[PDB]
Design a binder for these strands. Structure first.
Ligand SMILES: [Mg+2]
Ligand SMILES: [Mg+2]
Ligand SMILES: [Mg+2]
Ligand SMILES: [Mg+2]
Ligand SMILES: [Mg+2]
Ligand SMILES: [Mg+2]
Ligand SMILES: [Mg+2]
Ligand SMILES: [Mg+2]
Ligand SMILES: [Mg+2]
Ligand SMILES: [Mg+2]
Ligand SMILES: [Mg+2]
Ligand SMILES: [Mg+2]
Ligand SMILES: [Mg+2]
Ligand SMILES: [Mg+2]
Ligand SMILES: [Mg+2]
Ligand SMILES: [Mg+2]
Ligand SMILES: [Mg+2]
Ligand SMILES: [Mg+2]
Ligand SMILES: [Mg+2]
Ligand SMILES: [Mg+2]
Ligand SMILES: [Mg+2]
Ligand SMILES: [Mg+2]
Ligand SMILES: [Mg+2]
Ligand SMILES: [Mg+2]
Ligand SMILES: [Mg+2]
Ligand SMILES: [Mg+2]
Ligand SMILES: [Mg+2]
Ligand SMILES: [Mg+2]
Ligand SMILES: [Mg+2]
Ligand SMILES: [Mg+2]
Ligand SMILES: [Mg+2]
Ligand SMILES: [Mg+2]
Ligand SMILES: [Mg+2]
Ligand SMILES: [Zn+2]
Lengths: 142, 175, 38, 209
RNA sequence: UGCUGAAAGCAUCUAAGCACGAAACUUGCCCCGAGAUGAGUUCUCCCUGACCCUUUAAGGGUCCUGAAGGAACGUUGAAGA
RNA sequence: CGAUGUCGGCUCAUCACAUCCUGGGGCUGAAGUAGGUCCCAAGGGUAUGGCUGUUCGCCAUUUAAAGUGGUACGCGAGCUG
RNA sequence: GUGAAGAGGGAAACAACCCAGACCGCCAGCUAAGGUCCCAAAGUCAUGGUUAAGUGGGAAACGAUGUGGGAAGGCCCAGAC
């Protein structure tokens, strides 16, 4: 016989709501990337997105240890020659706090079209509310 | 340690409200409120506040001794108040008070006006002397530092705003 | 402010204090003695 | 503060009594009429949408004419939109005259500049010409070098090169307003505004004062 | 640079807590900008027919219909290779 | 070594900061003015001529200042020679 | 000793380092170095400590009441500091 493979048509996906208040950033993010990848399912398949849709709320109340709130630095580059930019953690939290979770998970996900498809299922919200009540999402504690 | 072991006796006319780590001390001069560190255990021994290291922490006696000397100062502030005196050394240097503002004339091309905070009341007996009173010690010291900062005293003549108690180490302009 | 690798007490009134990860000598008597390890 | 939509009529001069000639730019400002009021509950921000002038009725389209008919207002040659300050509001069919600028002193004029077409780096970026003699082979107005040798095999972004010059939105700031003639719908500003003669202008009160 | 303040009965700008502080940083000024594929928002306009088939489905075909609008052409432009 | 055009100038520049100016401070054997020195700071700015192939340099006269370096001692499928 | 004339696994990538020497095939199992949060296979294992520096994850003379442990000492309820 041959080893089973999941099929993207017959695969079922579920919805989960995670509250990110007070939780450690990376220890949250690796469980999110685990469940977006689908490595908690027996029908895991590397080339198939078998993960679950995840709504993350209270993203602005995520916690880091140490002095990383003032010392963790998010660099990027605009393409232009001087265009190195820089923002700290608490600046990113005040300015645009969803990016912190998005960046950590994007770094823990695979690189490619499938990893970008896994990232499309991550839906973060700074507040405590969402418009996705129509999908009947279950709660999940991480 | 030696500071934290000595309990702080609340006198009469001093109302004390314990709320978790939040401590409100009222009195005849005003109310003061301070949230302590979670490493500090505070308790009222029927005439005194005592200050112990809460377990599961590290800087126990350090935070306890800080919360001790703080609530001692909060008590003295709400039953006596603090009084910081400043004097002005220099020609043409003067001060005037308008309620909760101070109109300094410190040899600038522009008038200096300083708004007073909430629980701080000032008074000029003389033009070259400022006496300010209030409850919080950190605040009267902060306001006196700000008022000193306009004309920090010159070492060649002692000229400028000084504390009424500090010493001004002078310097001779040699040749 | 002298800024050195070697900061030392220069008089009886010098006091070595670590403010914000930096060894600093402060002297109430002589302002020349104030140092900063860097 | 909101602005008004006018049109560049031309330039002239105002002789003062003192013997000073003030070069002014005549901006006729017809009645800007509002067509839509945008708010926080529907649109997320507070602004108005105005129209001015007239337009041929056979040429104005049914979507556009329904948009003017809902406000109940005569069409115009365009639709512009001005963000509202606080404590400031307007109705829908309201007409706005140039008397709004009756007590302003400086304005910022936004217009579309003249089209220079495809311009070289001498004209566009004010590069120096090379030597017109002393041996120059076919390289009199060229840009010269554009990079460096192998370290970044590549030209950097935003390198100043030739291309389209003009025909773009520019804003001239802090123009002293001279005269406000509400009767013939004019606005005389000191100096030269962008745009050719007969083009639309956006006159807003000066933010830098 | 400080305030209060312990550890370390003092002292101490710091360990807890608080304040000030530069042409740098982020904003504020100007321009581009929803291919921002995370492709967004608002307003307005248009189309309100019949039937056949099988492989029955986001199916195929016939006849009728051809909207809003657009494109094309022409006259052209202080727009433009 | 079955070819990687090697001084200098021109035009184009761009980065570092061990900062020349401007900016903020500390000490001064800092009266003031003007300075010395060190610390922070790279946002912008940062000469024209005579001689010489010159870089450099000297000189003249300016300037807030006339920075130090990297970039195949930047740049010849861009010029010159 | 390896490469040359030697593949495979690891050290990010990395002839010469570490493990180990490819007859062929298998959708079987055990291990080596090295590893076990995710990219990326396997311990968010257990027990007891240390570090607060993102040290780990680049560097000296020298400097410093950082902090943990140990052995000894001299003042001290005849009252120390
Ligand atoms: Mg050094
Ligand atoms: Mg043109
Ligand atoms: Mg020339
Ligand atoms: Mg030729
Ligand atoms: Mg020629
Ligand atoms: Mg490359
Ligand atoms: Mg103290
Ligand atoms: Mg103190
Ligand atoms: Mg500022
Ligand atoms: Mg300026
Ligand atoms: Mg050769
Ligand atoms: Mg060849
Ligand atoms: Mg520096
Ligand atoms: Mg100085
Ligand atoms: Mg510069
Ligand atoms: Mg720059
Ligand atoms: Mg800036
Ligand atoms: Mg010269
Ligand atoms: Mg001559
Ligand atoms: Mg070199
Ligand atoms: Mg060269
Ligand atoms: Mg060079
Ligand atoms: Mg070349
Ligand atoms: Mg050459
Ligand atoms: Mg070439
Ligand atoms: Mg090998
Ligand atoms: Mg190998
Ligand atoms: Mg390696
Ligand atoms: Mg490899
Ligand atoms: Mg092993
Ligand atoms: Mg990979
Ligand atoms: Mg795994
Ligand atoms: Mg564990
Ligand atoms: Zn000293």
């Amino acid at each position: 016989m041959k080893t089973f493979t999941a099929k993207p048509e017959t695969v079922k996906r579920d919805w989960y709501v995670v509250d990110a208040t007070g939780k450690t950033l990376g220890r949250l993010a690796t469980e999110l990337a685990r469940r977006l990848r689908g490595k908690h399912k027996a029908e895991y398949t590397p080339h198939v997105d078998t993960g679950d849709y995840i709504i993350v709320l209270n993203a602005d109340k995520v916690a880091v240890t140490g002095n990383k709130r003032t010392d963790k630095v998010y660099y990027h580059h605009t393409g232009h020659i001087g265009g190195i930019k820089q923002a700290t953690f608490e600046e990113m939290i005040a300015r645009r706090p969803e990016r912190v979770i998005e960046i950590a998970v994007k770094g823990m996900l695979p690189k490619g079209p499938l990893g970008r498809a896994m990232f499309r299922k991550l839906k973060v919200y700074a507040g405590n509310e969402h418009n996705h009540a129509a999908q009947q999402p279950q709660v999940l504690d991480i | 340690s030696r500071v934290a072991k000595a309990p702080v006796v609340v006198p009469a006319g001093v109302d004390v409200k314990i709320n978790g780590q939040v401590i409100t001390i009222k009195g005849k001069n005003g109310e003061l409120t301070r949230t302590l560190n979670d490493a500090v255990e505070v308790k009222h021994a029927d005439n005194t506040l005592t200050f112990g290291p809460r377990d599961g922490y590290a800087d126990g006696w350090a935070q306890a001794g800080t919360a001790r000397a703080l609530l001692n100062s909060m008590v003295i502030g709400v039953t006596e108040g603090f009084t910081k005196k400043l004097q002005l050394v220099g020609v043409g240097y003067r001060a005037a008070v308008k309620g909760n503002v101070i109109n300094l004339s410190l040899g600038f091309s522009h008038p200096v006006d300083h708004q007073l905070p909430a629980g701080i009341t000032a008074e000029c007996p003389t033009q070259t002397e400022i006496v300010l009173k209030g409850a919080d010690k950190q605040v009267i010291g902060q306001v006196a530092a700000d008022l000193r900062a306009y004309r920090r005293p010159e070492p060649y003549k002692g000229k400028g705003v000084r504390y009424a108690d500090e010493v001004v180490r002078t310097k001779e302009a040699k040749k | 402010m002298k800024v050195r690798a070697s900061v030392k007490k220069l008089c009886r009134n010098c006091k070595i204090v670590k403010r914000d990860g930096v060894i600093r000598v402060i002297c109430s008597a002589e302002p020349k003695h104030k140092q900063r390890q860097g | 503060m909101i602005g008004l939509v006018g049109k560049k009529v031309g330039m002239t001069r105002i002789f003062t009594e003192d013997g000073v000639s003030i070069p002014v730019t005549v901006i006729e400002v017809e009645a800007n009429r509002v067509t839509q009021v945008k708010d926080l509950a529907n649109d997320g921000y507070r602004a108005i949408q105005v129209t001015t002038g007239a337009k041929k009725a056979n040429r104005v389209t049914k979507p556009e004419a329904g948009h003017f008919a809902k406000a109940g207002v005569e069409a115009g040659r365009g639709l512009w939109e001005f963000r509202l300050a606080e404590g400031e509001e307007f109705t829908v069919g309201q007409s706005i005259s140039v008397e709004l600028f009756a007590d302003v002193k400086k304005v910022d004029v936004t217009g579309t500049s003249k089209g220079k077409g495809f311009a070289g780096t001498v004209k566009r970026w004010n590069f120096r010409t090379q030597d017109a003699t002393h041996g120059n082979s076919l390289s009199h107005r060229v840009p010269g070098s554009i990079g460096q040798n192998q370290t970044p095999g590549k030209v950097f972004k935003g390198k100043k090169m030739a291309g389209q010059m003009g025909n773009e939105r520019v804003t001239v700031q802090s123009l002293d307003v001279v005269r406000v003639d509400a009767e013939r719908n004019l606005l005389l500003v000191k100096g030269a505004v962008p745009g050719a003669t007969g083009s639309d202008l956006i006159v807003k009160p000066a933010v830098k004062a």
